[PDB]
Amino acid sequence: IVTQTMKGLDIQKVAGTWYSLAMAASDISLLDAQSAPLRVYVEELKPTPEGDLEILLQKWENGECAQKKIIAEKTKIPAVFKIDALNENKVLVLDTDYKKYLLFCMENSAEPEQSLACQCLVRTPEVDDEALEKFDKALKALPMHIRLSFNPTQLEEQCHI
Amino acid sequence: IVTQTMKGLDIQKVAGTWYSLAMAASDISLLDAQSAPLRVYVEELKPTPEGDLEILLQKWENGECAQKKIIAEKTKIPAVFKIDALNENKVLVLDTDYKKYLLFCMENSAEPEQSLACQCLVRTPEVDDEALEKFDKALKALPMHIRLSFNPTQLEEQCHI
Numbered sequence: 001i002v003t004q005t006m007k008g009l010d011i012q013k014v015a016g017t018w019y020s021l022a023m024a025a026s027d028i029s030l031l032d033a034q035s036a037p038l039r040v041y042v043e044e045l046k047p048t049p050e051g052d053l054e055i056l057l058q059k060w061e062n063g064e065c066a067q068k069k070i071i072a073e074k075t076k077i078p079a080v081f082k083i084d085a086l087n088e089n090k091v092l093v094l095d096t097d098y099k100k101y102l103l104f105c106m107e108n109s110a111e112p113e114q115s116l117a118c119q120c121l122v123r124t125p126e127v128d129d130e131a132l133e134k135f136d137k138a139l140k141a142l143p144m145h146i147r148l149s150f151n152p153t154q155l156e157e158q159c160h161i
Numbered sequence: 162i163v164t165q166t167m168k169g170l171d172i173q174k175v176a177g178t179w180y181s182l183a184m185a186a187s188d189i190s191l192l193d194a195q196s197a198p199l200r201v202y203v204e205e206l207k208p209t210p211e212g213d214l215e216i217l218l219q220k221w222e223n224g225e226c227a228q229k230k231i232i233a234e235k236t237k238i239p240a241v242f243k244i245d246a247l248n249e250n251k252v253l254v255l256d257t258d259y260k261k262y263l264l265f266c267m268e269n270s271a272e273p274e275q276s277l278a279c280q281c282l283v284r285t286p287e288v289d290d291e292a293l294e295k296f297d298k299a300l301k302a303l304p305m306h307i308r309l310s311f312n313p314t315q316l317e318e319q320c321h322i
């Protein structure tokens with residue numbers, strides 16, 4: 001569904017702290033509630049020597065903000081990883097400069113229209129218009145129906161409260 | 162995929178304590194590890210007045226056994242519920258006597274061959290052959306490739322260690 005991947009990515013380079021500045025889903029319900037399925041906040045990204053992608057993220061669950069740790073296994077394509085689970089789910093890195101922003105999407109494979117959410121990761125808790133634009137441009141073709149945006153205050157808060 | 166549902170079920174009646182005596186999946190990887198995707202242990206089932214199905218279960222995660230709480234929303238069919246999440250996943254109650262055992266399956270809808278696990282819930286931490294048989298019979302048509310069985314000792318242990 002996602003027809004953008006960035007060429008010649010250096011996954012080890014996207015290691016560190018990230019701020020989920022914004023997010024978008026193809027179905028309102030994927031992000032609607034606080035406990036909505038794909039409403040996750042990225043704490044940090046750590047690539048493993050083997051070239052896999054460990055993701056740290058907060059997630060509102062059962063009444064309170066819960067930390068979570070995920071492993072996305074590399075595949076033959078550098079910018080595409082698969083996180084270990086049910087129904088099959090692929091992570092795609094669309095574009096990044098390693099030091100400012102990162103656009104990446106997650107889709108459940110088959111005919112994922114009933115599965116796709118993208119985020120705009122930034123390094124600092126500032127609103128980066130330049131980044132927001134590339135996000136908005138990237139999603140332009142994408143069949144998104146919900147879009148969230150967070151402010152610096154919220155970004156320095158657990159689960160962006 | 163699952164062509165067995167039990168007629169005239171009384172969901173309020175399946176409330177209480179349950180022991181996951183055994184489990185089966187259509188893909189070895191759904192149950193292979195300790196951290197395998199569908200390797201969940203049922204603590205108890207609580208139906209809500211509205212007719213929904215709250216499931217309590219343990220799950221080995223990130224190195225230790227974690228408690229988890231799930232809500233399966235009723236649908237027009239009494240024995241079929243949908244738990245609130247990504248990729249779409251349906252819970253089916255195949256057969257039960259409320260007081261001894263419960264057979265129920267979980268499948269991700271579409272062409273779920275890459276999605277189906279069933280369990281044999283019992284009320285006591287004893288091995289119930291009668292129950293095991295109905296489980297084994299029910300699964301007979303089902304394309305299962307992994308099957309686990311737990312002993313009383315394990316059943317009185319968190320995450321069946």
Ligand SMILES: CC1=C(/C=C/C(C)=C/C=C/C(C)=C\C(=O)O)C(C)(C)CCC1
Binds near residue numbers: 070083106
């Ligand atoms: C949607 C989405 C992402 C995936 C989140 C996932 C797949 C989290 C895993 C959660 C776990 C294992 C369980 C749970 O939430 O209960 C990532 C950050 C990759 C990219 C931005 C969009």
Ligand SMILES: CC1=C(/C=C/C(C)=C/C=C/C(C)=C\C(=O)O)C(C)(C)CCC1
Binds near residue numbers: 218266279
């Ligand atoms: C497979 C399976 C079941 C489903 C388990 C589910 C769907 C658990 C939810 C887990 C959560 C929300 C997240 C996680 O594991 O990270 C039930 C007990 C219905 C019936 C027996 C087979």
